Symmetry: C2
Subunit: 624 residues, 2 copies
């Protein structure tokens, strides 16, 4: 095992455990100290204003198992500190018959048991577990724990009748899944159900959704309501909130609804952020965010989706969320988005970016797997004065359209996503910022033009505004993590409406994934404009490439170039001519970003362990 | 619910939980503070000379489940003190994937991990578990924990490769069971195997047996040897120590070997107690004690047995224990005998006496189930100068015979059992002792003759020596827990060699068992004697009746008379005449015994709880 990054990589499978720990590792984002991580969980803003973030964690292993809550906190979403207790950075772990198979995803009741922050989580026990298996009742239940020390530790309710688990009966037979309880308050749903509370007797101020589906018949999001305010044991099943068909797709802009939901949440937004009105705010929109499984050929069969919904009240005192329009939260290698309320009328969302090493070839050599996305403010994106000649505008696929009185302009509404401003300010202020001169890409443009200032390492951000002619057939974008021999190309092609990440040359190491990423982006053309504009921002963070377009489209992916000098960046141009010109302006490079874990040393590996021959006997976890 | 014990019992199933807690409860023996108990476990003499006793425990329930080690200690086997920690009187409980289904029976390595007392125990996980089910590998494994505070708490080794569980591979396929590891030192087995240690590489000073069997092919006791002295992770399977046939019986004196062994142990005894020689002591005998299942029509299909064995060394460096003669450790409602070494060359044995409420009719009303037997010294019982005309003497069924040179007398050898002298001394010294006049039972004997002094409550001991003619057809014995309307009759019938306990009138409460208990007793006739003698001792302790005959035969059973005055005792006589006389002498009543738990109040119930609907979903425990 040579770690010489000035020559071609050897056979890196001969390298020892965690010998590649720092090589490709993100530094500017949320990531576990070591080992396996997946979904964010237990997210809440604490009483002191700081953010508590949990995550599905399996320390000292590089595959999933014994899944536990790891945790950390931050005053600004950006610089983090690990909890450190009797179980290291873990704060909840399998310990009881009802959760011994795994402490799955859960969410926070901020004023819960005895007034303390309380987590409702999926407690898993023995038996087949999965949407393509014959799962039985009891294997996935929902349980409570509360914290008296602001998340340093959690105390579970006792096992038994009238205690944990608190939700265990399946609401319908033959479920594909029954997990990821999302607890939320909703003046909107309270107002809608107020006339029906005699029917169900559920009058509490908290709601909870549970994610799943029905065998052969598509995904389901099940709605529960807390039975009585101030009491947390009894949750009354109302009915299915979202019902979709077996591998139903709303279309090209909307992924696929698969066979089963995971990590679903419910929110209400307006143009400024979170909306806490009862329906009276006409600018507010109800949204559901959700993962789907087995509706995709790649990306581990997973889509992270969202839908704008219109609520209808059923005669039995339940709510049907009718999908109005439907989109994608991130088009790349990310999943398990969780959102939570933040002071100042914000709803903040964060997901999990998985690696691109599906065959587990270098996972032990890394000594870790997984990271978070950046934290994102959600809001209703509104585009005014949209030209009706915008191609495809009235499909209304992942957006709504509203005509002006005279029919000559349109107001477009969709889900907005942007990186939280605390992170952008910290990144910029800690970086070496280079403000670059605008560039016209014409007949003289090379295929690749390096920026006049270059990154110094694999931790940087780029931004640029690309102005295209309305009938362009040119392509443009950014190349990142680039040397002569390795590079990753981010292209936008307005004629096809496709944002792609081409990774055929991303790395000399052939075991990592090299498939092309794709997102659809609609450039809403403005009345009177003779051009259309793509604002593209890219974060490069170790192996993470996280792309944002027009505060709307997100695409997270991975690139693992071997060579030490594969860090460069610049502009891409294809089919630009004297007549078909792409104007690039607002160009800026931020080199360095932020050290997101200042108390951590560079190498926080504690080694890896094997569970031994019993792992295969129990059959629950891979064991490593 | 009336608790008026001066009138007939009502419908006692209407009584609340633990309302009958003190009514039938033993006071003079080892018993849990409340709830379910079964097998003794983790027995050892601590460094200060006190005795540590563990037991299978399920607090606040009256059926088995979440099975844990409850524990207590005593300086004299007789007066006990509960441990009290974070889990009350529990000291080991299900907590890890490998033991979450139950912390089953285990035994003590006195100088174990880091020099501390260490328990090797059966750690159980998910799946079918039982001799009549299709159990798989992993469901029962063997794990270590050690104590740094003399049994107040135990620390388990970590889960994983080279740690817990330490024994998990099945030594043969299709096992009926794989549990109850019994760890022991044996100069005898070391000496026998010394010439074969090149074959196996196992040279440690501890051995361990694991109890089980093979589907369709009878029970097995598997022998392991510690691989290396001072190291406790690696245990090398040598081979089957005891192999018996599917429901094989050695005969009427020997119970039945069933289909599977439980709680088996290995010891070496001589006439004084424990023998620690290497084979050089010609008076010493190797014994195996073991439970068998599914070889009995009643008594919950369980026999607690023992066998004298002769060890043979196999060519592969293992030991075959060849059964020389085979007997019964207790003929009544007891099981799960554990034995352990005690200073002064003693081996002490103790078992579990179950209730006689198989249909679970009044278990909740009790608020507890189960107790221990008394603690018993084991030794080789030797009877000299036995007459060869003793009927059946040369069947050698549960004994051996050795002729004198002249063939006119015989030395009989068998397993001896007697109550530990510490308990007998404490019982007698704390009791009101009545020494009774000898009685000849002849033509004038009533069927029942009360003793001249009577017990004052349900806590007493009796003793008597019954002298019979060599061709008697008379019967005699003791009646206990007796009023006019309720009584329990203990008879010996020398013509049939049957000691019986007739329980047809034991209680007015009809839900308790009333079947007749039976033990075989051989009266070894002495050369020149014109009579044969039965020394019979009976302990009455709440509902326990525990009978000992000739320091050899033990029979534990239950009687639950309702009436407050059903406490009397006296002599029984049947078919005694002027010519067929039974002489009774050495008669003594000890009224009161000892309060075995002086720190406990009378009612130590903490109520009962239900596990809720998930108990049936998981399917592992009854849930109450
Ligand atoms: C199989 O058997 C298993 C083992 O028995 C069993 O698991 C056990 O289940 C029981 C029963 O559910 C659990 O008991 C509960 O424990 C809760 C506390 O849990 C936390 O703390 C304990 C104890 O912590 C001490 O000890 C440890 C270990 O040494 C130390 O690390 C600690 O520092 C601490 O040490 C101090 O105290 C020691 C003695 O206790 C001293 O020795 C020492 O010197 C120190 O001073 C921990 O062990 C727990 O850890 C475990 O669990 C966590 C998850 O929770 C895991 O992460 C971890 O790995 C461990 O597994 C944990 O940290 C108690 O709160 C709880 O008691 C409440 O509930 C019951 C009702 O069920 C009531 O009877 C009781 O009165 C309590 O309720 C009151 O309190 C709260 C307020 O605090 C109220 O919400 C409630 O309404 C009520 O209020 C009352 O009082 C109010 C105020 O006065 C009043 O106003 C009200 O009106 C009202 O009257 C209960 O005891 C036990 O933790 C489990 N143990 C383990 C190891 O798992 C398992 O379930 C069984 N399985 C099956 C299938 O049956
Ligand atoms: C799924 O995830 C689960 C959760 O992660 C996981 O379970 C956990 O597994 C890990 C790994 O196996 C366990 O970690 C071990 O813990 C042992 C100690 O266990 C006891 O103590 C802990 C901690 O107790 C503190 O905290 C609790 C809780 O607050 C308090 O109640 C205590 O009072 C105590 O508090 C003090 O300390 C705190 C911080 O630690 C402070 O906050 C506080 O202020 C106090 O000061 C308890 O939690 C344990 O309870 C649990 O387990 C018991 C059963 O054991 C249950 O009954 C109970 O209900 C709980 O479930 C328990 O009481 C450690 O000894 C052990 O560390 C040794 O082993 C590892 C090797 O594996 C070494 O890395 C390490 O160095 C240690 O080895 C050395 O030490 C011993 C000597 O002591 C030697 O034998 C050994 O050779 C070695 O010696 C070294 O040092 C020598 C001297 O210097 C030197 O000479 C030698 O040469 C050598 O170098 C390890 O940390 C963890 O307990 C589990 N936790 C739980 C909750 O279950 C589960 O396995 C996972 N499942 C799967 C399927 O993967
Ligand atoms: C005395 O001790 C017992 C523990 O043994 C305490 O708890 C009770 O245990 C018994 C089992 O011994 C439970 O009986 C079972 O009940 C279920 C149905 O229960 C439902 O209906 C009840 C009647 O109103 C109700 O009390 C229950 O409410 C509890 O449970 C829910 C969770 O489901 C929880 O949310 C509540 O807060 C309560 O904790 C519940 O709604 C029944 O299906 C079982 O039937 C089987 O067994 C019986 C007997 O053989 C048989 O007849 C059936 O055919 C079937 O085989 C079983 O009857 C009882 O529910 C428990 N009660 C509780 C927890 O309140 C009991 O509390 C102790 N008493 C006191 C005064 O302390
Ligand atoms: C690096 O990190 C790993 C954790 O990932 C550390 O532990 C090793 O993990 C790997 C899995 O990643 C284990 O590989 C498996 O090994 C078994 C066979 O193991 C046996 O033979 C080994 C070779 O000598 C030996 O080391 C093992 O000894 C350990 O385990 C026993 C208990 O069985 C215990 O008593 C000992 O004390 C040791 O702890 C053992 O005897 C093999 O069956 C597995 O095969 C599967 O997977 C591979 C890979 O896909 C495949 O090729 C097979 O076809 C099959 O699919 C697997 O190879 C390895 O055994 C673990 N080694 C240990 C625990 O020592 C590792 O230690 C870390 N290294 C360092 C230097 O820290
Ligand atoms: O829910 C997202 C799907 C997903 C994606 C990758 C996984 O992750 C990787 C990425 O290459 O694939 C491997 C699993 O085959 C895993 O070792 C690795 O971390 C995974 O466990 C779930
Ligand atoms: O291993 C001894 C067999 C045995 C005997 C009785 C049991 O015990 C009793 C006694 O009536 O039977 C009942 C089980 O049906 C149990 O509630 C009760 O304690 C038991 O669980 C195992
Ligand atoms: O770590 C768990 C969290 O990860 C999520 C989101 O990816 O997916 C469940 C993944 C999963 C794990 C084990 C299985 O047997 C299975 O079929 C699917 C959540 O649904 C969940 O709470
Ligand atoms: O509490 C356990 C201890 O009790 C013993 C002795 O009676 O028997 C096992 C009883 C048993 C429990 C659960 C089962 O599924 C089963 O088939 C038998 C031991 O073998 C053991 O360690
Ligand atoms: C980068 O490193 C490679 C390999 O060491 C070298 O060939 C190349 O000239 C370097 N510089 C580049 C590609 O700009
Ligand atoms: C790389 O090394 C592995 C052993 O880890 C070996 O199996 C594989 O064939 C090697 N690949 C080569 C030499 O290309
Ligand atoms: C309410 O009605 C809906 C629509 O038929 C149904 O799916 C749901 O199960 C009902 N809720 C109940 C029975 O609680
Ligand atoms: C909206 O405007 C477009 C363009 O003028 C027109 O084709 C369409 O019919 C209008 N829709 C409505 C509902 O008026
Ligand atoms: C650098 O980042 C830190 C950590 O997020 C932040 O608090 C600080 O304000 C930043 N420095 C600037 C903007 O100068
Ligand atoms: C015992 O009590 C019963 C019922 O109260 C009574 O009939 C009887 O006379 C009493 N004394 C006896 C049986 O010696
Ligand atoms: C005793 O009470 C139970 C209720 O616990 C009842 O079912 C049974 O029939 C009663 N037996 C009688 C009255 O004999
Ligand atoms: C014993 O105590 C328990 C628990 O407090 C109580 O429910 C029960 O009625 C008591 N029984 C007696 C006989 O005092
Ligand atoms: C040793 O031989 C015996 C007798 O055939 C056999 O039962 C046992 O399994 C053998 N031991 C091994 C293979 O370790
Ligand atoms: C033992 O003694 C009996 C009675 O004298 C006799 O029948 C038997 O043959 C003797 N056995 C041996 C082995 O000498
Ligand atoms: C009474 O019993 C106690 C407890 O076992 C014992 O220590 C004491 O010696 C006994 N009293 C006597 C024999 O007088
Ligand atoms: O096909 C869209 C035709 C059209 C309708 C109204 C407009 O204002 C427009 O610019 C184009
Ligand atoms: O049947 C036993 C005959 C017998 C042999 C030797 C004796 O010493 C005896 O008393 C009887």
């Amino acid at each position: 095992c040579s770690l010489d990054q000035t020559v071609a990589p050897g056979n890196l499978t001969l390298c020892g455990n965690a010998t590649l720990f720092t090589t490709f590792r993100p530094k500017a984002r949320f990531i576990a100290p070591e080992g396996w991580m997946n979904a964010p969980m237990g997210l809440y803003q604490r009483a002191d204003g700081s953010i508590h973030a949990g995550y599905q964690s399996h320390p000292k292993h590089i595959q999933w198992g014994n899944i536990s809550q790891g945790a950390a906190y931050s005053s600004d979403f950006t610089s983090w500190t690990d909890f450190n207790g009797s179980e290291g950075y873990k704060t909840i772990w399998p310990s009881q018959i009802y959760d011994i198979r795994g402490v799955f995803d859960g969410s926070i009741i901020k004023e819960g048991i005895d007034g303390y922050p309380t987590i409702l989580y999926t407690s898993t026990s023995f038996g087949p577990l999965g949407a393509t298996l014959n799962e039985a009742e009891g294997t996935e239940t929902q349980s409570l724990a509360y914290t008296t020390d602001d998340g340093a530790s959690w105390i579970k309710l006792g096992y038994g009748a009238g205690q944990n688990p608190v939700i265990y009966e399946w609401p319908e037979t033959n479920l594909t899944g029954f997990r990821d309880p999302y607890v939320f308050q909703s003046p909107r749903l309270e107002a809608l159900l107020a006339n029906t509370t005699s029917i169900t007797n559920a009058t509490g101020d908290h709601f909870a959704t549970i994610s799943g589906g029905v065998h052969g018949d598509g995904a389901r999001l099940f709605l529960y309501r807390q039975h009585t305010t101030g009491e947390f044991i009894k949750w009354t099943y109302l009915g299915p909130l979202v019902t979709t068909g077996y591998k139903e797709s709303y279309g090209e802009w909307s992924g696929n609804y698969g066979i089963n939901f995971e990590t679903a949440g419910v929110t209400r937004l307006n143009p400024a952020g979170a909306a806490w009105d009862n329906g009276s705010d006409t600018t507010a929109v109800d949204f559901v965010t959700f993962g789907t499984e087995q509706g995709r050929a790649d990306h581990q069969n997973h889509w992270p989706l969202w839908a704008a919904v219109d609520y209808e009240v059923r005669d039995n005192g339940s709510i049907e969320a009718v999908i109005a329009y439907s989109g994608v939260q991130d088009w790349g290698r990310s999943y398990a988005y969780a959102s939570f309320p933040v002071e100042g009328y914000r709803q903040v969302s964060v997901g999990w970016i998985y690696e691109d090493d599906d065959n587990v070839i270098l996972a032990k050599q890394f000594g870790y797997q997984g990271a978070f996305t950046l934290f994102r403010d959600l809001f209703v994106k509104v585009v005014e004065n949209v030209s009706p000649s915008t191609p495809g505008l009235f499909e209304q696929a992942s957006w709504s359209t509203k005509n002006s009185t005279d029919g000559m302009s349109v107001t477009v509404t969709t889900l907005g996503q942007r990186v939280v401003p605390e992170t952008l300010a910290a990144y910029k202020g800690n970086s070496t910022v280079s403000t670059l001169a605008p560039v016209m890409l014409n007949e003289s443009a090379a295929a690749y033009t390096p920026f006049s200032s270059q990154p110094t390492d694999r931790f940087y951000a780029l931004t640029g505004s690309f102005e295209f002619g309305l009938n362009t057939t040119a392509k443009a974008g950014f190349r990142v993590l680039a040397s002569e021999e390795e590079y990753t190309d981010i292209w936008f092609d307005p004629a096809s409406e496709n944002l792609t990440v081409v990774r055929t040359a991303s790395s000399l190491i052939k075991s990592f994934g090299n498939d092309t990423e794709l997102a659809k982006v609609k450039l809403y053309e403005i009345v009177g404009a003779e051009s259309k504009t793509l604002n593209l921002t890219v974060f490069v963070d170790g192996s993470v490439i996280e792309i944002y377009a027009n505060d709307e489209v997100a695409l997270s992916t991975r690139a693992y170039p071997w060579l030490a000098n594969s860090t460069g960046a610049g502009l891409l141009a294809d089919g630009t001519t004297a007549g078909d010109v792409v104007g690039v302006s607002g160009l800026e490079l931020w080199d360095g970003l932020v050290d997101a874990w200042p108390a951590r040393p560079a190498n926080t590996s504690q080694g890896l362990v094997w569970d031994g021959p019993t792992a295969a006997m129990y059959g629950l976890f891979a064991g490593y």
